[PDB]
Amino acid sequence: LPALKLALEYIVPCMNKHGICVVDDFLGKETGQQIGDEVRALHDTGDKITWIEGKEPGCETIGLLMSSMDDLIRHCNGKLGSYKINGRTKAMVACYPGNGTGYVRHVDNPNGDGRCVTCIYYLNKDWDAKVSGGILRIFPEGKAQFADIEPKFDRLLFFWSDRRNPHEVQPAYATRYAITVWYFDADERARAKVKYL
Ligand SMILES: COc1ccc2cc(-c3cnc(C(=O)NCC(=O)O)c(O)c3)ccc2c1
Ligand SMILES: [Mn+2]
DSSP states (O other), X not given: OOXXXXXIIIIHHHHHHTSEEEEESSSHHHHHHHHHHHHHHHHTTOOOEEEEOSOSTTOHHXXXXXXXXXXXXXXXXXXXXXXXXXXXXXXXXXXXXXSSEEEEEEOSOSSOOSEEEEEEEEOBXXXXXXXHBOXXXXXXXXXXXXXXXXXXXXXXXXXXXXXTOOEEEEEESSOEEEEEEEEEEHHHHHHHHHHHO
């Protein structure tokens, strides 16, 4: 699907209706394999998370992914709830070493630091939840039933960052790589800037 078709006909209505969106095969085997090579390079060369602006040497494919997310979000702007997106963080590359680690139930932005949307990219090739686990569970503002998201390769996930989506990362018994970008709300972020100082 083209960027604006994907955005308008899927991500926008889907975030409004559920607040959680998954897009599979986002960039294809070739681009995704390259992204994975770069991430595996970052970790297998040498703080289990690192921040990438996208123009660093060797992260050019990562910057490509960040740019693609940006394109989607540009097309969603003004249609994603009442938020106006005017910026985003750098990309956080995250590693779960595979020793039974995870992340306890948490909320990304519970103190109004400006982040509304969370964007995760999964680079895990031939990943079996049964054997390796590492599933992300989102409990969408209650909603009676949670959502289990496998970190399947070339998968792009969006969800609201505020209290609406509490989520946990179930223990990982294989090495788990992902890339996360957060998108800001203009007004919330401007109020946050003043409070921090
Ligand atoms: C010390 O400075 C910081 C600043 C921000 C940080 C954010 C996270 C974080 C938050 N959420 C998730 C998550 O929900 N991941 C779901 C998934 O991977 O599928 C995650 O993996 C990692 C961890 C450490 C941080 C350290
Ligand atoms: Mn999180």
